[model samples]
Target: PRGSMIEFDNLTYLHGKPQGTGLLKANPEDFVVVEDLGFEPDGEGEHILVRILKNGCNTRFVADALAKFLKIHAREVSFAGQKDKHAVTEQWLCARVPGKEMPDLSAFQLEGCQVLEYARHKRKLRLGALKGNAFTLVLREVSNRDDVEQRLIDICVKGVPNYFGAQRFGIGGSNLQGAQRWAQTNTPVRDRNKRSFWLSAARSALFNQIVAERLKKADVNQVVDGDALQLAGRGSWFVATTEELAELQRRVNDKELMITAALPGSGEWGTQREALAFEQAAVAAETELQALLVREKVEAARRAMLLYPQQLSWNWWDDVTVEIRFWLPAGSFATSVVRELINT
Candidate 1:
């Protein structure tokens, strides 16, 4: 029999376990704190230096504050990425704080926000400035100690499938419904929140559809051999014999699929053909799944989607250690990959 209809409840239960609290403080050893200096050109286009401090702040909120400080457009103040609103995330922010001999940054006050230190830089902090983020997530309220321990060990050995958590969609799984509406009407979402919501919902829906198609045709372990079977480590396809493919499929069922790459969407599309093509095109173009729906508008459609098409390449030389490197396009998640390999 086909599995029970996948409900939002199941989806949330699988991926929606909140890990950390909003008011959680970081242990001194867990974080490497650095006060970044912001910079831009002087009147002569030469870099002028200024000093200030912004600590324990959310990136987007600070961007708004900096926009007020400079009396410029909020969009002009650029930051690499949005940090978690609940957590104390530190990163460099750039704004053209001009004209004032000495500007006071004392007014931008919010709980869990403070200015620790700052300085002027020769250039604005461009996006993707840091090599990679190092996170020390502290998961609390752990219950089911034995199951949790076993699950963690299992993850350390094999890896979790790279599924987009509920965060990718929206609260209460409304994003998926929003996506279905967009697909049916071809309506354009003007709001960024709605846009992101629809994109993720569409992609997840498509992935589930593809997976359902595959599951309908074959058992969990039977690798339906052919041109499908997308290796998540790369956006590449290969044909596998039924016997050989069944072994690979079993890994997924056993929850033993090692993290060769992160699976972005969900369902059995990871090992299906048409779905793989859809995913590959989404990845190569760096857009959302809706792009696949445009008739005579494939390019336009592709521009509107964001899929996790990147995979992690890895080599295991011993039982205890394996080397892993993820090749993802800009703005894709590395934690999407890391979450697969380790519980962290």
Candidate 2:
């Protein structure tokens, strides 16, 4: 089956809903809450809490708003990850509001931004309190409905090859050749931004290479003897070899694996293989980036992943919503999954 094309409200979207099934289930807004941080008399610490809203706004926007509202430095606030500027996202934001007896949060209001609920916690909303994010995507303006639906069903049954989307390497897409040059030359990027870009580029380049190698030997619909399989129901992954494990892997890898769906943004038409290769490369690059950060004595990088989980799951019958959960080791992208899941 060919790919199904759908029109979204924007380049992307994200929605969250309460978990569980039946009449007892609640809407996302029902659980929405926002809390304000109180100031400590001796300036011991700060406290603040915020929940991300669907299509609410960007992370920087939220951060800036909190800073302005509290009259505190923007850097004083912290968050686990960046939310899409155009998507409906929910996340936690924390800031220190010490010294002030009672601060006003009314000035920080926007069309999409809302203070759902509020409370005072002992500590500020720390980054990574979230275990994972649940996503409910609506693929609108779909083309080739029938065929697309069937293909999507197949994808839902057989997990899509994890692949990196084109956004990783910048506007023109990843410049594998340029990345190769930078990696081989070992030229240090003097400018901070430039250096970061090249590092990512090099990482993407290496990831694609590894994915290409895997595709060359593996079957798309069936798990190979030595394949590494991810558990659809949980965030666990294991090597397939033992009878029991192989049976489980087979069930998960089978094109009919229940509750397991393919990652989106696979290449269209003949480029499918290329797309998978790219995504694999991106994951590899991300892993390597974290490893390097740890080597450099960068505690931030080591601490980031703890903020999110590596696996996300959802029950379709619960609400026809998709939840993607992953721990992005600090400096890693939540969009890495997005890149693998959909086309920009």
Candidate 3:
């Protein structure tokens, strides 16, 4: 039998019950995002990076269209990551145009997009190159305004579980179902892009479940014996030793480190003893997915269990309407934070 599937919304909430009910993204403008490239462009190279402010546009669609306008193949275009299609988002798109001067986009325009700026860079813009994204969200028709504000402050201080947002599973867990099919049949997903997407969905699901199990135990913040700990704002991690649990927990509480959950793939890196036993039990039902991941040789990676929004602030646009703004570290989801406040 195929293993029982975890519903995308079935996971535990770090912030407990939702604050209230509200409408999210009643309009595209209600959700706004600005990407941080993490570094300034070199301003001198074959690749031209254009900053575009767009509404209701897909990141890949914009990149392909930019390549079309630059008279280049679609593969020549790149972006840091995808943005919400229903939001007003400002993102950088890059096109590799060699032996040609920067084409003036001052007069160029696209549907739902405006060219904000352009610069030449020495290197092509890469995926996952962003430092973070800043978000301004307006929740409308909110209930319990006082409680909602209190919840916002609570999130700002203690943060929320770093669950992979529902978007990662595709609409209605379509990507996950596809991954499950591939795992059960042992069929090779030929397209590199499609293969990566499926693998990501499967792994993200496992990680989310592990985090959920920890939440069930009221252990998300605790550095358990044999737990893997990742440094704050960095990818490297180490397994915590029993001798240093107290010291490590102190660092974790101070935000210098974070307890992590496994991404569940091949390689020797992961938790041992108590942590390993918990993770294994959490994902035990998905033997096919685990075997497939091992055969595919995806590297074992760790993700922090908590997400802290930087510079979190909010204001009431009007009674029953609220505007919240915050910046998140790269790879964290803004919707995860919003879900803590209202039924967005």
Best-fitting candidate, scored by TM-score = 3
- Candidate 3: stretches off by over 4 Å: 1-3
TM-score of each: 0.51, 0.52, 0.96
Q: Please give, for residues 157-211, the per-residue lDDT of candidate 3 as tens digits.
A: 7898888899998788788888988998867889998888889998999988888
Model 1: how far residue 253 lies from native, Å: 16
Report the poorest 10 consecutive residues by lDDT, candidate 1: 298-307
Q: How displaced is residue 22 in candidate 1, in Å?
A: 16
Q: What is the lDDT of residue 141 in candidate 2?
A: 30
> On TM-score, who's better, 2 or 3?
3
lDDT of 2: 0.41
Best by lDDT: 3
**Model 3 TM-score relative to the real fold:** 0.96
Which residue runs does candidate 1 get wrong by more than 4 Å? Answer: 1-58, 96-110, 116-132, 204-344
Model 2 Cα displacement at 281 (Å)?
12
For model 3, the run of ten residues with the poorest summed lDDT: 1-10
Compared with the true structure, all predictions reach lDDT values of 0.43, 0.41, 0.87
Order of quality (TM-score): 3, 2, 1
Best-to-worst ranking by lDDT: 3, 1, 2
